[PDB]
Amino acid sequence: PKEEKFKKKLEEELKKIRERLLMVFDEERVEEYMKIMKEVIEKILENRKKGSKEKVEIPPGMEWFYENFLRYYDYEEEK
Amino acid sequence: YDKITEEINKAIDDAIAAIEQSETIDPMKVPDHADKFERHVGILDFKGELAMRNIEARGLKQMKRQGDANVKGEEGIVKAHLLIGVHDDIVSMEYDLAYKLGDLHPTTHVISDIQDFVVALSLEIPDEGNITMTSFEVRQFANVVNHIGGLSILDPIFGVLSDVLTAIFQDTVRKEMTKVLAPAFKRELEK
């Protein structure tokens, strides 16, 4: 339903992220970073689906993305 | 002490009212800035440059004195500390950002929102007459929220530019806003 549209929009955002990163770094680092981000996303979504308030373990450097994706998801559950 | 506090508040509100009716305050032009930045986020290491042009601050016309004037009596001299703020409004900066990271060299309009923008000043008054402003500074911004066009909130480029612009605001923008706000307040308070 709305969560399918959410997943589609998120995948489109990720495609744009990859395409812009390829303009700055090499494909190995870009794709590895995409993998890291998707792992973080899946942890966050799994945590929220159980109504949990416990913070998930975030690899170093991805705390900014943790907060920003929390805000992003909350905006998209409002909308 | 109530007479002193009232006279200080009266002078400060007259000052603020004269300041708010100046076209230099809202909108306030900020000198153009450019910097180089290096930020290491996990495996990603961003080394780039950015240039902010046409910087404009809006929302300073809602400046109001916050709390009673802090009056101190030391050695027969009146010494006051005061806070003048824009709560119930946000100070908003709009500018054009041109950044360069590797091959990517985009140019986007950015809107940064300062929450709880407030300035602090310190007056020295010989108890007989005349006001002297001895200190003046714009406070460290509690939070600078950046809205960069073209970038998602998830984009690493957004996080990097957000961090760099926030640091630039906590340094360059704060000082250049102080350079405009201090002399006008000095004029109104010491006249």
From Swiss-Prot, chain B:
Glycosylated residues in this chain: N130
Main location: secreted
Protein name (Swiss-Prot/TrEMBL): Mite allergen Der f 7
Keywords: Allergen, Glycoprotein, Secreted, Signal
Gene it is expressed from: DERF7
GO CC terms: extracellular region
Family membership noted in the UniProt record: Belongs to the mite group 7 allergen family.
InterPro entries tied to this protein: Mite_allergen_7_sf, Mite_allergen_group-7
Location of this chain's protein in the cell: Secreted
